[PDB]
Amino acid sequence: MKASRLYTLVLVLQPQRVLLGMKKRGFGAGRWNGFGGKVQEGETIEDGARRELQEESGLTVDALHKVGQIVFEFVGEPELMDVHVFCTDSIQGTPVESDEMRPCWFQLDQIPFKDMWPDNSYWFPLLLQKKKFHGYFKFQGQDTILDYTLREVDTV
Ligand SMILES: Nc1nc2c([nH]c(=O)n2[C@H]2C[C@H](O)[C@@H](COP(=O)(O)OP(=O)(O)OP(=O)(O)O)O2)c(=O)[nH]1
């Protein structure tokens, strides 16, 4: 009986590494994140994901593939986040730091889970195995999960 707002999250996943972005400023700074943000009026979810990737990382790609959907709920916030998660298939430039985000590559045996949002530990492994998923996580603040669900699915 809550409303949701649409967000995207994009993982540039290559065979041996993944690109993540360090939030540099404001509340939440200091954590490594996928690239993403609010979907804007009119644009498709995929086009919103492509735009956020360009804005936050500098990479321009023609196409993404959707791998999952995750709902976030925060204690004290009545609006849910409806997060559509995408991976890149191919990229063709270099990442660039903004004043808001610093991109960095991590080898896939060095995924920095302790410095990522806590839910990422649950769904990232499915993403790495090329599986699709649906998830829901309820947070007290930034660090504490009170309830969550995660299910591999055949169709997002
Ligand atoms: N639980 C969880 N929350 C995340 C992840 N990544 C992520 O940005 N968030 C949270 C932090 C923020 O509350 C929200 C992101 O919203 P935002 O306002 O930063 O998005 P945005 O950059 O489009 O905002 P704006 O600059 O356009 O105002 O989602 C994640 O992987 N897991």
Author numbering: 1 to 156
Article, verbatim:
To validate the correlations between the structure and kinetics in the Asp-120 mutants, crystal structures of the Asp-120 mutants (D120N and D120A) in complex with 8-oxo-dGTP or 2-oxo-dATP were determined, respectively. In contrast, during the recognition of 8-oxo-dGTP, the structures of both mutants (D120N and D120A) show modes of binding of 8-oxo-dGTP that are different from that of the wild type. The face of 8-oxoG and the direction of deoxyribose are completely turned over in comparison with those in the wild type complex: this phenomenon is the result of the loss of two hydrogen bonds between Asp-120 and 8-oxoG. In the D120N complex, Asp-119 and Asn-120 interact with H-N2-C2-N1-H and O6 of 8-oxoG, respectively, whereas Asn-33 with O6 and N7-H of 8-oxoG. The 3′-OH group of deoxyribose in both complexes is directed away from Thr-8 and Gly-34, which are involved in the recognition of 3′-OH in the wild type. These findings are in agreement with the higher Km values of both mutants for 8-oxo-dGTP in comparison with the wild type. The electron densities of 8-oxo-dGTP in both mutants are ambiguous as compared with those in the wild type. This result indicates lower occupancy and/or loose binding of 8-oxo-dGTP. The differences in the recognition of the 8-oxoG and deoxyribose moieties between the wild type and the mutants give rise to the difference in the position of the triphosphate moiety in 8-oxo-dGTP between the mutant structures and the original ones (active configuration bound to the Nudix motif) in the wild type structure. The structural arrangement of the triphosphate reflects the lower kcat values in both mutants.
